[PDB]
Structure formats: C-alpha cells, structure tokens
Design a protein around this nucleic acid. Structure first.
Ligand code: DUP
Ligand code: CA
Ligand code: CA
Ligand code: CA
Ligand code: CA
Length: 903
DNA sequence: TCAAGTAAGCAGTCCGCG
DNA sequence: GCGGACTGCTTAC
C-alpha cells in the first residue's frame, strides 16, 4: 500500500511525523525539514515558479524552519511580500504525500476514553487535579477492547472488585445491563492504589498510543485532568508521556467573554466528540450532557443511580464502574450512527491537514488551495492583516402575513458555490471592475450589459473567462462528492417511505430483513419482496434505511458546510484569500438571482393564467421561492381529483414540465446578461404543499420573514406516506422553547394545516386545562447564559439584567455556601422558570443547569412557587396567538349565535 | 462558546408617550 | 400597553 501520515507536528527545527508505512506498520520519525518560501524577482530571472497573478518568483531554501520564520519577519520589516506556505508542517505533508491519499482506517488507532473522579467538595477542577482518578475506561479501536482501570483504594473509600457477572444482568435483576455485545470485549484491571493505576495506564498508553483521541468532553475535562493529576503525583516529565514526542503545551483559548485551559499533546489528534457533535450534527440542543445526547440520538433511557455521583463509588462501586464503561460505549454508538470520525478522516486526508483542523474551514481551505496551486508550480500570497468590515448578504422578501393553501417551493442547487463556479470567482481571476447601476436595474433588466468580454457580478466585479480559477476548480471537486452522497441520502429516504408504506399491510410470518443497499432506489423485485414481509422485518429494514439516510446526511451536509465555508471565508480577515470584492460579488449575485427569477416566475404565471400584476411569488429567502398555486389548482377544479395524491401528481407534473423550463430559460438569459462563464443556476422544485382533500386544513401560513409552516406531501422527489410538517423559524423549532410546549405548538400547527379552526380550538383548550400536570423540566424555558459576572453585583441583578441571568442569580443565592450544589457554568445553558409573587426566593424567576434535575436543596420550593400562568402565556399562548392571527382564524369560538336558548 | 458568512426574528429592560 | 433603542439569544439560509 501507499503510505499515509497519522500525525504531524513542528517542534523547533524538526518535523515529527507518525505514519503508516508501505507495509502497514505504524512508524515515527524526526525530520529536519528545510522549507521553501518565495519572493518576487525580475522577469529576466527565468524561473519555474509564479505567484497566482503570473508574477515570477524565486524560491528561497532555508537551512531550517527558524531561519525561514525569521526571514518572514525581515521581509515584513523591509515591507515586501514573503510568499509560500508559512505553516511548515503543511508544506511537509505536501512534499511527503504528493498524491491523492488513500487511507486505511483499520490501521488508525482511534481511542475513546472516559474517566471518573470522586469529589465531595465541588466540581473537580482539571487544573487543580487534587482528587484521585478512581476509574478509567479506554476503548481501543484496533484491539476493539474496553480497557477498564479500577481504583480499589482511595481516601474516599475502599471497595471490592467490579463484577462482570452482575454487570451483565438486567437492571431488573440488580445488574447494570452492560450490553451483551461488549461484555466479551472488556479487559478489567483493578488496582490497589492510584499510583499503580496511573503508571500502568501510561505503560498501556505507550503501547497503544492514540492517534485520534476522542470521548465526551475529553478536551476540557478528561485530558487536562489526567495530565494534571499525573503531573501533581509524578511530575511533568512523566505527565508529558501522554505525548508520543514528550511535548505538551498548555493552551487557550478564545474569549470573549473569559477563558479556559486545555493541554495540547503533540503527536496526538484530539477530536472531542462534543465538539464534533456541535459542528457536524446541525442540531441545537437544550443540553449537551452525554445523557441527554444519548437519549436524543439513540433513544436509550438515561443511566440512573441513587445519590449524587460524588457518593456513587462508595455506596455502589459496582454501578460506578459499569456506568463508566457504558459512557464510553454510548459515544461509540453515537458515532456508528452519525459517523463523524469517518467524516473527519475523509476531510483531513483530502485537504492534507492535521485531522483536528477539520474544525477550521480556513485552515482546511488554505491547505486544499495550496496543494492545488503547488501542483502547477504556483506560489501562494502572504497572509495579510485586514480590519473587520461589515458587508451585505442574502435578500429576504417581506411576506404578506397570511394563510396559504396551495404552495410549491423552488430552490437553487447549492447557491453560493454555484455562483462561484458560474461567475468564476477567485482571487486570481479578478479582471477589473465596471460602473455599477443600482441592483434593481439589473433585476429588472434595464441596466446596460456590464461586459462584452468578462464574467460579471452586479456588485461591479469582472472575472476572466479563459480558464477556471483555483477556487471554482477546487470547490467544484467537493461539490461533486457532496452531490454523490446526497444522492445516496435521498435514495435511502425514498426507500424508507416504501417500507413505511408496506407497514400498513404487514404479512403474518417469520422471515428476515432483505439484504439490500439502501443507498439505491429499490428494484421492482425488492419492492415485491417487501410487500410480502413481516412487521418485525419491515421495521428492521426501516431502521437500516434510516441509518443509511443518516450516514448520507452526515456525508453530504458537512461537505456542503465546507464549500459554503469557502464562500464565507472570503469574508473572514484571517483567510489568506480574504477579499470583500469576492465575498460581495457572491452575495450580490445571489440577491439579483432570486429577485430576477421572482420577476420571471410571476411573469410566466400571469401569462399562463391570463392575468396581470398578481404576486404568485409570496415569499423568498436567499435562494428559494414560494409560489402560491391556488389558481393552478382551481383551473382544473379541485373537485376533479380522486384524492390528495392526484393533485400532488398534477402539481408535480406542472412544476417539472412547465415551470422549470420557464425557470431555466429565465436563468439562461441572466447568464448571458452577466456574460457568465458557465450557466449553473439550477432551480428545482423543492416542496408541494396543501391541505388534505375534503379537509378544512389551511395548508400553510407565514407570520413574517423566516417564520412559516407548510403541510408538505412531496419534498424534492420524496413522496411521503404521511404528510410531513415543514415548520421554519416558529417556536416549535427553537431550543429555547419548552419540550412540552414545542410538541403542543406543533400539534396545534398540524391541526391548523390539516384539520382546521375547529380541531385547533379543541386542542388548544385541552392543552390549557392539562398544562399544570406537565413535569417541570418539560415546561422550563432554555437559554445560554453569558456574562453572568457582568450583571452580578448583589449578587443581585445589576442594571439591564437579562431575565435568564436574573434566574441564575436567584439560583446562586438559594444555594449560597452549599459546596455540593451543582454550579451554573458560564457559557452553558440553563433551564428557566418564573416564580409567583411573594416566593421565598425573592425574585421573579430561578434558573439551573440545563440537562439536570434542580438540586434537592431547593427543588420542592421551586415546584411550589412555579408560575404556571406566566409560563403558559409566554411560551404557548402568545406564540399560538401569533400563528392564528397571521393565519386569519380564531383559537377560540367565538360567538355562535346560535344556539336556540343559549343566546 | 476556538474553529466561514449575513439576515432577521422574538424576549426582555428601560422609558417614553401628554 | 405599545413601540423604539438596545442587549441577548436563536433561527434560516
Ligand atoms: O450555514 C449556511 C447555510 C447557507 N448559507 C448560504 C450559502 C448557501 O448556498 C445558501 C442557501 O443555503 P441552502 O440551505 O439552501 N443550501 P444550498 O443552497 O447551499 O445547497 P442545497 O440547497 O443544494 O443544500 O445560503 C450559508 O452561507 N451558510
Ligand atoms: Ca439551495
Ligand atoms: Ca439542499
Ligand atoms: Ca404485505
Ligand atoms: Ca433553501
């Protein structure tokens, strides 16, 4: 096989690389790498290196990396550009792996660990590490084994050995229900004292040195704690053994706001799964406790135990250890589903960066662009400092707030990247400017053609049309991968609906799930076989189809985040290729494109329907348009339709055969108008929405910009077995809205859109009656909590004190001088509840760490003093009244009148 | 919440608004 | 009480 790096670091004048060699063995080397940088020179100087603008450069080979750094400094002092890759390890990888890397994950040691530390006197601060580590479970991907390190003797209690037998038994039998599938994979090692535990751990570590090191909060907790506890007991040198190169760096951070300390272990690539989850998952969670995330992702009931965690070890060591093992596993389970580790390796190897740099699209794109340019003997520009300037983005149409019965949406394929490609937008394809007219002029096709020669954006920029720029070229590469996985994602989806469909008529028999590949649309043969299956088998397949769809969503959306990250980076002053001319050429092109195709659609529809001036486009945001189809449905009748599927078929057909051609034509014109390099404005039908036929549903509604709801029957070719609600921006979709309330608001929306006013009133009233029965966590608001210290004076609320922050202050007072009480953590999320007047807490609300039960120290009084009425009308009623008025209907009947004597 | 971008909504505070 | 100037937070894209 071809070799690949595992990790790379620059330590002084040496590069340290861990790699897999041509024979599949992990190796390590130290290399005194001599970097090259560049500087402009006179033309006569016949060279083979040119800066991206075609200016000739001379390569300067330095004896070592310090010299090269120093040279950059001097070039600055003199005031000349120092060109080339100044991050030397990236240049190293580029020279060392001058090919498309093919990795083998089975050779890569991915280590997943979790530790426990008993602490009775507060949260065990990693930088303090004053408490013994009494448990460590460390899973190794190569061995596929859970290594358990169990402290038996501590100042906080002496315990007996964990029992794998009891671990396996059902919770209902006194066991801990450690899943049978990993029971065999557990290597258990009890220790008589902590020193012996930690020494063995390091020895173990030296032998199976993590390449990728992950887990849950390992970067802000596990790692710095192990590092500092070993340092406290044995000294730095021993602690530095966590680094294959024995080099570590204390490190921090970024604001804004405050700071935190992490330990940088050289030679290791740390991908804290919480951070991976935050970047790649596209969810916003009320809490990021592993318990909460586990239940969310896997639907596993949270691990339960009596007493505080700080007493768990000594009252129930059995469970303590078992839960440390399950913690490690839950993370493995999330990854098997979401597959963020795979995604990270893919991206890091693609770009040829430290794996952990996938967290940075700027670092990622620098590297992609640099390797691409280096291939042609081109030299990259020096990174320069810029002041931060605001700059305009997308256009958002103001909608008339209303109900909307029949809606079809259309959406441009991957807008910003497509604009980059169509226009040929790149640092080195800038051809000049033209005298701009107001945007509206281009929109209405009255402005003079910007250029007969170059490819233009309405922001005034012109671009070469002879050759593709490196930004278009490279962005095209990731766009195509993205597209491939989206195909797999959508096919797994369509397939899922077929299984769901079958689940209406499950056959009575024992059989197996069909061995198929859910990334591809089912063959008619597989379709027949599914109709003949049992519910148990159909359910299983459905599970696998949905797991395929999730795998595809991970692969596709994050490749989209990457390429969209490029368009955005052009607006970030830290990007080597930062340029507001290019950033705004992209966003201004977008504005034009959307309102241009709005004018076109309206025009098309006023002709076909034989009217004038009608606004068929009711809304639009960035790259999408929403068209009112009432009139298109009416033309046929609305009777004349057997069922709901019948008109969806009709609308589908109309979109595909009449509108998209008209839409393509409109965009082809615009391409010519801007004299663009390549027409890539592809706007496909996205959503088909309306109420069930014969129903009183209102189909859809809008309250304003970025706030709407729709009863979707078909989405991007996926024809749902059950209508799916697409709700955007409304409180159902916000993490700050209480769980119970979201659910309730959603049912309310479902009833409005599917059943109508009367079904709506009925539920709203039923909810209002039963509200007070809801569990307190399910009805608490949620907020991030920033700048507490800022508004703390009393500690009472200082001037301008935010509501949630005030709640925190109320909490802090209630638990004053209570060392065990859970502490609200600056920058994290809290649950918030209002409190009735005259409550013992002395304020109008209280707040506590989200994800948790509020301590037993105050729970009872909080429950007694919760203001249900306030809570209710702020979170449920008010927003609901917002929906109903925009929709022009009533959540309460409502004069009869009628009836006979009740009148 | 270290880690590409802007647009824009709603909650809440403070205070005007005769 | 509703709305602006504003801070904080959170979506859509
Ligand atoms: O996080 C984002 C999301 C979108 N955008 C911009 C770029 C994107 O092209 C445009 C429209 O985003 P969509 O959510 O519609 N996805 P996109 O159009 O990129 O591709 P697709 O619709 O095929 O997913 O909005 C960002 O800048 N950042
Ligand atoms: Ca799009
Ligand atoms: Ca899309
Ligand atoms: Ca059947
Ligand atoms: Ca969109």
């Amino acid at each position: 096989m071809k070799e690949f790096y595992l990790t790379v670091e620059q330590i002084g004048d040496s590069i340290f690389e861990r790699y897999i060699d041509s024979n599949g063995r992990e190796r390590t080397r130290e290399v005194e790498y001599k970097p090259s940088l560049f500087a402009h020179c006179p033309e006569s100087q016949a060279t083979k290196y040119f800066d991206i603008y075609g200016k000739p450069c001379t390569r300067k080979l330095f004896a070592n990396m310090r010299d090269a750094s120093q040279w950059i400094k001097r070039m600055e002092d003199i005031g000349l550009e120092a060109l080339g890759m100044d991050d030397f390890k990236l240049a190293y990888l580029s020279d060392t792996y001058n090919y498309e890397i093919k990795y083998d994950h089975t050779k890569i040691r991915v280590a997943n660990f979790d530790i426990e530390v008993t602490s009775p006197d507060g949260f065990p601060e990693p930088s303090q590490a004053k408490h013994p580590i009494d448990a460590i479970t460390h899973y190794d991907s190569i061995d596929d084994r859970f290594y358990v390190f169990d402290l038996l003797n501590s100042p906080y209690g002496n315990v007996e050995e964990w029992s794998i037998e009891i671990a396996a038994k059902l919770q209902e039998q006194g066991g801990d229900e450690v899943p049978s599938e990993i029971i065999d994979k557990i290597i258990y090692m009890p220790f008589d004292n902590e020193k012996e535990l930690l020494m063995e751990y390091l020895n173990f570590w030296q032998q199976k040195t993590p390449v990728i090191l992950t887990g849950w909060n390992v970067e802000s907790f596990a790692i710095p704690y192990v590092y500092n506890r070993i340092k406290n007991i044995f000294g730095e040198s021993t602690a530095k053994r966590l680094s294959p190169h024995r080099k570590t760096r204390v490190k921090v951070i970024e604001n804004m706001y405050g700071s935190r300390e992490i330990i940088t272990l050289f030679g290791i690539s740390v991908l804290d799964y919480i951070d991976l989850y935050k970047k790649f998952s596209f969810t916003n969670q009320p809490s990021y406790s592993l318990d909460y995330i586990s239940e969310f992702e896997l639907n596993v009931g949270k691990l339960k135990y009596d007493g505080p965690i700080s007493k768990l070890r000594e009252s129930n060591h059995q469970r303590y250890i078992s839960y440390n093992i399950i913690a490690v596993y839950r993370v493995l389970q999330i990854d098997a589903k979401r597959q963020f580790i795979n995604l990270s390796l893919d991206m890091g190897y693609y770009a040829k960066i430290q794996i952990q740099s996938v967290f940075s699209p700027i670092k990622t794109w620098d590297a992609i662009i640099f390797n691409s340019l280096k291939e042609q003997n081109k030299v990259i520009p020096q990174g320069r400092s810029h002041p931060v300037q605001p700059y305009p983005g997308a256009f958002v149409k103001e909608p008339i707030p209303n109900r909307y019965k029949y809606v079809m949406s259309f959406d441009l394929t991957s807008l910003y990247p497509s604009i980059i490609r169509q226009v040929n937008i790149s640092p080195e394809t800038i051809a000049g400017t033209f005298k701009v007219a107001p945007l509206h002029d281009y929109i209405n096709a009255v402005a003079e053609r910007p250029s007969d020669v170059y490819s233009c954006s309405p922001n005034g920029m012109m671009y070469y049309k002879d050759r593709d720029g490196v930004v278009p070229t490279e962005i095209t590469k990731v766009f195509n991968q993205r597209k491939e996985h989206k195909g797999y994602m959508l096919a797994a989806q369509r397939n899922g609906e077929i299984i769901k469909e079958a689940l209406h008529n499950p056959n009575l028999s024992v059989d197996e799930p069909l061995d198929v590949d859910y990334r591809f649309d089912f063959s008619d043969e597989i379709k027949e076989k599914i109709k003949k299956l049992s519910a148990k088998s159909l359910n299983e397949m459905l599970f696998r189809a949905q797991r395929t769809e999730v795998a595809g969503m991970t692969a596709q959306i994050n490749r989209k985040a990457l390429i969209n990250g490029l368009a955005g980076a052009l607006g970030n002053v830290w990007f080597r290729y930062y340029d507001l001319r290019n950033a705004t050429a992209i966003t201004t092109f977008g504005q034009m494109a959307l309102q241009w195709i709005e004018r076109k659609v309206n025009e098309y529809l006023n002709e076909v329907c034989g009217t004038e001036g009608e606004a068929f486009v009711l809304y639009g945001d960035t790259d999408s348009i929403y068209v009112s189809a009432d009139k298109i449905i009416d033309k046929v009748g609305e009777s004349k339709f057997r069922d709901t599927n019948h008109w969806v078929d009709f609308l589908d057909k109309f979109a595909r055969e009449r509108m998209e051609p008209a839409i393509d034509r409109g965009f082809r014109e615009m391409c010519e108008y801007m004299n663009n390099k390549q027409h890539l404005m592809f706007m496909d039908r996205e959503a088909i929405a309306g109420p069930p036929l014969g129903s009183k549903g209102i189909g859809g509604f809008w309250t304003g910009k970025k706030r709407y709801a729709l009863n979707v029957w078909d989405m991007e070719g996926t024809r749902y077995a059950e209508p799916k609600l697409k709700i955007m921006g409304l409180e159902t979709q916000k993490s700050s809205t209480p769980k119970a309330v979201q659910k309730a608001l959603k049912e309310c929306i479902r009833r409005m859109l599917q059943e109508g006013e009367e079904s709506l009133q009925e539920y709203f009233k039923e909810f209002e009656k039963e509200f007070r029965q809801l569990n307190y966590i399910s009805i608490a608001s949620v907020s991030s909590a920033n700048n507490i210290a800022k508004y703390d004076v009393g500690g009472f609320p200082g001037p301008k004190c935010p509501f949630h922050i005030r709640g925190i202050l109320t909490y802090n007072r209630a638990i004053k001088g209570n060392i065990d009480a859970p502490q609200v953590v600056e920058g994290e999320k809290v649950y918030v509840l209002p409190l009735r007047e005259g409550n013992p807490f002395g304020d109008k609300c209280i707040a506590w760490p989200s994800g948790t039960e509020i301590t037993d120290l105050i729970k009872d009084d909080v429950l007694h003093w919760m203001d249900y009425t306030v809570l209710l009308e702020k979170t449920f009623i008010k927003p609901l009244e917002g929906f109903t008025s925009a929709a022009k209907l009533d959540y309460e009947k409502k004069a009869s009148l009628f009836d006979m004597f009740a009148f």
